[PDB]
Known about the structure:
By secondary structure, this protein is an alpha+beta fold. It has 2 domains: 16-105, no CATH class; 106-204, no CATH class. The protein is 29% helix and 22% strand. The protein has helices at 29-40, 42-45, 71-75, 80-93, 112-123, 128-140; strands at 50-57, 62-68, 97-98, 101-103, 146-153, 162-163, 167-169, 182-185, 195-201. Strands 5, 6, 7, 8 and 9 form a 5-stranded antiparallel β-sheet that branches. Helix 5 (112-123) runs antiparallel to helix 6 (128-140). The structure holds one RNA strand.
Amino acid sequence: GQKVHPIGMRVGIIRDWDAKWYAEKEYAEFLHEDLRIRKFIATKLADAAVSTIEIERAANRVNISIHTAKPGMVIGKGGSEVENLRKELNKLTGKRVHINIVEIKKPDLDAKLVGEGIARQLENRVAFRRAQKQAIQRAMRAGAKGIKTQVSGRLNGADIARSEGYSEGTVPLHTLRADIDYAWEEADTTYGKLGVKVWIYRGE
RNA sequence: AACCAGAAAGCCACGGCUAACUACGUGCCAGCAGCCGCGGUAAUACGUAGGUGGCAAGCGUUGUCCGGAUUUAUUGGGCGUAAAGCGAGCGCAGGCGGUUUCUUAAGUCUGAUGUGAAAGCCCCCGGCUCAACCGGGGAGGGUCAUUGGAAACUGGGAGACUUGAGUGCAGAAGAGGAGAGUGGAAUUCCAUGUGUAGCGGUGAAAUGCGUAGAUAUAUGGAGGAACACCAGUGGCGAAGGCGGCUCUCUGGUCUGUAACUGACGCUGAGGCUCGAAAGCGUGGGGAGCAAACAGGAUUAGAUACCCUGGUAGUCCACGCCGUAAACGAUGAGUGCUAAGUGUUGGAGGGUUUCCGCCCUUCAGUGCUGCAGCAAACGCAUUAAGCACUCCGCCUGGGGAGUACGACCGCAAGGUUGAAACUCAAAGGAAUUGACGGGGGCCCGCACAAGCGGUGGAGCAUGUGGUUUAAUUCGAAGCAACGCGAAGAACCUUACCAGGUCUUGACAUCCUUUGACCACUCUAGAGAUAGAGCUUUCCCUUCGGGGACAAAGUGACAGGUGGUGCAUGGUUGUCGUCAGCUCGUGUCGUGAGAUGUUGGGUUAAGUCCCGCAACGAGCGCAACCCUUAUUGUUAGUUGCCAUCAUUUAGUUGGGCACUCUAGCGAGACUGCCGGUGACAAACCGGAGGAAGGUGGGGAUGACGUCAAAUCAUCAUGCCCCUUAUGACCUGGGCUACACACGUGCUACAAUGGGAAGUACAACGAGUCGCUAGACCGCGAGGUCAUGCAAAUCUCUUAAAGCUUCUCUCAGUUCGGAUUGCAGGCUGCAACUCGCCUGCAUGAAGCCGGAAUCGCUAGUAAUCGCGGAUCAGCACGCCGCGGUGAA
Length: 204
């Protein structure tokens, strides 16, 4: 293998961490509470289709935020769902949690959402080729600069594994002022587990 | 007329040809197939099941004949390289033939008559309830026989011609052939004079000839063979082939004229002639060269390539054989279809000194090229184009030009020429890639130049092996072996011996519920067992809920069990090498090609120039981090210059410097000269701290290697389930006849010892770094001191620098190994820690063949820190000091 996780390079330089705090001498509880909370909202993603998670740090409380393409579905009917969040969270935390929400815009040009969708389609035994192609269809036409898409594994629920994908636009990688995103998902019907990885580029 | 849906459907097949698909079973076994081919753990191909499709009183398999086969080509094929022009001529028989008048009517067309049995195939009509079937009536078939016409074509008869053929007359060239003599140069042997120790040979050498005078050198003699220069994609011949000179005999070709005969032509099975080199017979001749052979060499072996000798043969006369890649792999005759360009031999016309130019034409002889053709490669008036005549030859690759038979030959052999059996191929051309002991250009500690290492010694470590009750698993050329393991005494920990459990150590549900703890004493190696105060409602609306046990209940959990060859993800390498691609146009019958090539340039597919290509993407570079100069903003826990004082930058005083760290500034071929097509770029220069990617790092394109990993994690399938799941103690993983990889300490005088003497940098610190002081020589202990930080500590770094002693020895070097007494952490250091003191004092005096690293603050050498971590580092990750060739 040879390549480098691309949001593992622009981190710190032009894009910043997504857990903004500072903890000297208290640096395992904070980490393994952040991990706990980050894991336990995977229930929402089943339908809410969230993208990001921040972990701010109060004086003695927990302020976070999220983004998802459906604000009504997450907060619920009369905001009661967010209350179930609060009460499950503080019980999970032992610390007063103060959540917040912002709506994501142009949810086509994300990366985790797109991988979520194409893995979804691959679950329903659909042709990977047209899946990738219509993904990049709706993506590029939303206004972008380049997309690549890779798929690997026991393709078409078939014999010895392979990998191949298609790309339009143009995506420079070794350059740094790139702001390129990246997302990697998984699925399978009955043949082990497949692999899809997606890269976008939306400005330097 | 009566009664009953009642007694009455099988067969082949479903991967492509071909119409019709999915489960279960087996696992290169069973088995199947007309041909491709299926079968080694998820089979539409094997077997059953269920579906589907084709036919249906039938359905399949075998055997046989025609088809598709243009694969015997009359309709209707071919011979440059794919199978196939005889080696070439002379020619009886035969096949085919210039132009015109008259004639005849064999061939030809056409008319009448006879005749071509009946039943069949076909056409019309007809009869059995229709159909087969039956019936009537018509055509078709001759190359037949007789008889009548026509006269173009071919044939037969009497004619006439001149273009084809041939002859005459006038000229031209030639290594065309046979016979007879003759010339010079050269090599060799011989005779003689001079002459002294070598000659000759090879990649290197040797064998060999020589002091019975060699090689060399000079004079003459002998003998046989081939003909230096002219020599030319020139000449002649039917082909094989022919080159010194002169003579006697002798064949063929070409141009002119147009006297003469009047189609006398072409091709040509059997036959006859000629026929390179090697070979045979008989008789000569023999200088060089050379199969066989001998000796010398190289080689694992070399009856071969290389060297020194050498016999038949090579030559001459007369016979014999009759074969070559006998080639242009291209049968012969004849006529038609653009050009350009040389050259051998001619004949005409102008200029003319033309015998030196120019124009027309005949005949050979080469190169380029248009139509056309060709599967492409290519050929193209010297067709492999367009067409007629005559000949030869071919029909998948092997078996094999073999066997038998026949003819020829003295003999070797030659000509002619199969079948049994086997396979699904064997072939021609052309594209992409790879490879070469083929070529051209250019890079890298890859060579060369240096410095230092390993292989020899002791010890640490990871392996292979062996032993074991177990030495738990993985890693296997470079790209495994100080590797996962960045801390094996218990664990950790998979493995072995024991003692133990079952919805189980861990998760969820459900029934009763309801709040488990914790604590002590016993027996125990603990796991546990047994008793003791006990786990106690955290909401109440009067009804209830969570944490919680414990029991039960079945839902079940559980696995470091299996498959990197079913997989996701994550790495190693080619490689920091410079490459890999696409869209649209254009070329090619097609695989494919153009771009991406040529010239210049470069670290580079980096740029410039020209070009059927125009444009683009991942790559290169740049954007990033750090190091070197510094402006400014800020001055403590940092700094101390201007002042004072104290042990001191401490404490006053200050922020100047130093440093800390934000924002700025700065290197861009920016200006100078030159080289260069004025371009790109290149050589030198100024200025500047750094000059030409300033030094270093992060950054790893398409893909190769079924490389590695189910043991970080995840996961299909297969598997264990009162046991491969689970709890505890004790031992392993540290075993030792042995082979290897990586490291450390050394074999001393640039050194050993003793005593004084200064200078860094990176980072760690609350149950931890210890200040200071006291004690013991030491590892350390005791009491106490700051420090959650530029303050305090680890921590005055060690090599360095200055003196003294030791004298070349296994030494005062080396300190492995071992006895004894201690220290620290640890519930516990025999197995199996680190360290101290004393005592003993091993191998070891620079290491073979071989082999590694390195181009500068590098190599070499000396210390510091920290990751994991009670504790344990010669390892690993960083820092700094000294400083070469």
